[PDB]
């Protein structure tokens, strides 16, 4: 619910919603600024499946 930046020259990432040319955070965590990708890293985060990950799972 808080304002992280008012610079439109950014790429909204995960845990972030664009609104009225201003950027806000949707979760609670730290701000990450990699290249122009602006995202918020939440505290308690689950597993994010990415392409090329060696995982273990049981059939549901």
């Amino acid at each position: 619910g808080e304002l992280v930046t008012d610079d439109p020259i950014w790429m909204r990432g995960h845990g972030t919603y664009f609104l009225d040319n201003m950027t806000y955070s949707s979760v609670a965590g730290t701000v990450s600024r990699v290249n122009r990708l602006l995202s918020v890293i939440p505290l308690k985060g689950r597993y994010a499946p990415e392409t090329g990950d060696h995982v273990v799972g049981r059939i549901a």
Partner: protein, 241 residues
């Protein structure tokens, strides 16, 4: 207790507070890292509420599943020992409880970004260990802090505040003794704004007085937001370092 003074000419209420003072607010985050992904032990006054957020996960059955958003379930369970006199009724399937459970789902399904989590379900489990007036508002603040612990994307905070009107004097954060002697209004303010996601009036209030009650109600709700926000700052800073 007995026949008490609700609001004396000295501005003091039956519990010592004043017209614009709140009960002590002691929230707790991540109290059940072994039972749910989201946890919040809400202790607003004598009230002691345990809120769990299990999800977002796959539904137990593929029958009910929205392929464009998430399903938000709220389970409010008022324990028999919630008050002094142990409840003899069932409470679980009570019609008054189903209204509260539904009012909570509608309140947050518009605030929680269910679109970000499609084909999923978010179960919210609530257990009230003790109540003492203003129980609806404390249910609000518990769900807010429990979803944040679960890492669920929300647009803003949702604050729960209860306001009573005694003659011509509003009273913030009404306890049980104050609700049994005046009208009660529970509000659901979104963040530092004046947008109301909840407005419950269950007793007669003059129209010429409702506007001022709402203004003093949303003002105290912002104060409730900061106490929750400052709790997350202290919890996040001590967790990282």
């Amino acid at each position: 207790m007995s026949r008490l003074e609700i609001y004396s000419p000295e501005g003091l209420r039956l519990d010592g507070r004043r017209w614009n003072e709140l009960r002590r607010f002691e929230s707790s985050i991540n109290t059940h890292p072994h039972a749910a992904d989201g946890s919040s032990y809400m202790e607003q006054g004598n009230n002691k509420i345990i809120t769990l957020v299990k999800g977002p996960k796959e539904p137990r059955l593929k029958s009910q599943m929205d392929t464009s958003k998430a399903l938000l379930n709220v389970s409010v369970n008022i324990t028999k020992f919630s008050k002094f006199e142990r409840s003899k009724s069932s409470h679980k399937n009570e019609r008054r409880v189903l209204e509260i459970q539904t009012s909570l789902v509608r309140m947050f399904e518009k605030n929680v970004m269910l679109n970000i989590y499609p084909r999923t379900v978010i179960d919210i489990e609530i257990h009230v260990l003790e109540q003492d007036g203003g129980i609806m508002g404390s249910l609000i603040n518990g769900i807010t802090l429990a979803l944040i612990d679960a890492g669920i994307s929300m647009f803003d905070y949702i604050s729960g505040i209860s306001v009573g009107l005694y003659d011509t004097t509003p009273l913030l954060d009404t306890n049980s003794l104050e609700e049994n002697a005046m009208s009660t209004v529970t509000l659901g303010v979104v963040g530092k704004s004046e947008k109301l996601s909840l407005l419950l009036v269950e007793d007669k209030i003059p129209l010429d007085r409702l506007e001022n009650v709402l203004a003093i109600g949303i003002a105290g709700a912002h104060r409730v937001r900061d106490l929750m926000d400052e709790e997350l700052r202290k919890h996040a800073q001590k967790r990282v370092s």
